[PDB]
Amino acid sequence: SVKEFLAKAKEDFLKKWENPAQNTAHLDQFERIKTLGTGSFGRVMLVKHMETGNHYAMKILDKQKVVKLKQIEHTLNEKRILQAVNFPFLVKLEFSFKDNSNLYMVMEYVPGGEMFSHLRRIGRFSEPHARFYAAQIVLTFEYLHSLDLIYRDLKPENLLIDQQGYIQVTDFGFAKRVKGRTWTLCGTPEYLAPEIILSKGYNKAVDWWALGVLIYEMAAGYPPFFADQPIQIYEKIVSGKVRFPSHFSSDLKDLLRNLLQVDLTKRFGNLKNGVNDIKNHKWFATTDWIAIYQRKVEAPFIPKFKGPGDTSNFDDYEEEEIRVSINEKCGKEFSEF
């Protein structure tokens, strides 16, 4: 039943992957309202589409800045993948286009804010609350990895909460379709698996390590490896030692020991039984995976909604101009966008 779902999901994906949509709107069709964030690179702006009155979250990248940061291939990855995927816990790409200066990805607006905000304010989530979110990530990675995709930037900053209280994963700036191994140093310090830090070839197991970090951070209120500077975080990550709060359940600690496992032949997600080692673990015994997928499970909380276009679940950011040069920049580099 899972296999049959994923077979169909793959044929759907490959059709779009081999024939990507391009140039499906224009900037002048949107009214810019307010900046919602910054992601891996660029910024995200709340916009309103005039013809429908729908609100969207439009990611904007400056082509010249992308080139300087050596993110050309990663950016083409992001858009090609986003336009091809389809899953309940992935933010949907509605439109993409480019102009002389910038690249634009118009996504669904998810008004509940980043998990990050909610987590820092509350301090920590309960184990049942953490498990509800974690389950959604397990299913999302099951989907993505089946398509030979690695996500590579799991963190609370990238997990938006919808009006049903379910997660949508945003920002695919380091996502890559790769069979076998890859080598790019990318991600966020706290979430990096040891094999990335140590410049080894790595695979989708890095995402399962990152899940460990996330579940820990959600249930503890702080990450398993933290310091004032990245180098000190890396020394902690490669040490082989983790400490759990005394309030963590024995089932939670066992899951985490198997996710935050430096040894790849023992890391959950990466053994012969795949994602089933995680889905069948005792910590998830109360989890009804299909009801999670169907959004039939009652969420831990529902974000406050003040109206269409409300951004009060998001921090305020300095507003910057969307400048469009009269000369085309970087045309060849971004021709497929």
Binding site: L69, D153, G187, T188
Partner: peptide
């Protein structure tokens, strides 16, 4: 406490991605 150490740290806000 570990929580106090975290809250006093410089990495309790939104964290940026790295690259080389």
């Amino acid at each position: 406490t570990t929580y106090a150490d975290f809250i006093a740290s410089g990495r309790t806000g939104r964290r940026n991605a790295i690259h080389d």
